[PDB]
Amino acid sequence: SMSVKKPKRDDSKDLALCSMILTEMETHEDAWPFLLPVNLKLVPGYKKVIKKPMDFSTIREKLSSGQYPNLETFALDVRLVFDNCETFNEDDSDIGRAGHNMRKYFEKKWTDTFK
Template identity: 60%
Template sequence: RWSDAAAQLRSPSASTSSRSPLPGRSRSTEIILMEMEAHEDAWPFLEPVNPRLVPGYRRIIKNPMDLGTMRTRLLRGGYSCPSQFASDALLVFDNCRTFNEDESAVGRAGRSLRRFFESRWGFFLYFKLLFSN
C-alpha cells in the first residue's frame, strides 16, 4: 500500500494544477492520516477528549489535539505546510504521554501509534527528497 502512495507522489498527474490539493493538503498527509485513523491503536485519539468523561484533562493539557480535529483542519486547508500537520500529530502523542501512565491502555496505544506515524512520516520525507529533483 505504501508502494501505491509512492507511485502517487511520483506520478506526473500528481503535479498538474487540475489535480493539486488545497493549500496545506497533500496526498501524503491525507494518506498518513487515513492510515493513522485505521490503525488498531487509534481508538483513544479519533475524537477530542470529552472533559466530562475525563476530569482534569483540560487542566493538565492546555493544547488538546486529536485525529478528528486534524482531519477537519486538513479538509479545510488549515495546514499551510506538511510540517504543521506533523506538529499536530506529535502534539497528540505528547499530550497522551503527559496525561496517561506509560503502561495504561491509552499510554500503550499512544506509543504504538506514534511509532507508526514516525515510520510513515519518515517514508514521506524520504520520498519527498528523492523525487524533489
C-alpha cells in the same frame, strides 16, 4: 536571502500524501483513544492540564479546510496528540501503550514518505 533561493522542492503532493498517512493512522487498531476529542466535561483534570488538546478528527477537519500551511505544521499536530497522551497516561496502561505504538507507526510513515 533576497533573490537567492535553494532549488524548489515539489510540495504539490503533500496534501494528498498527509491525507493518506492520516487515513492509515485512523484505521490502525490502536487509534481508538485518539479518534475524537477527549470529553472535557467527563474527564477530570484534562481541561486544566492539557493546554492544547488534539485528536485525529480535529486534524482531519483542519486538513480538509486548508488550515495547515505546510507539512511541518501537520506533523506538529500529529505529535501533539502523542505528547498529550504521554502527559496524561501512565506508560503501563492500554492508552499509554497505544500512544507509543501510534507515534512509532506515524514516524516511520513520515520518514518513508518524505525523508
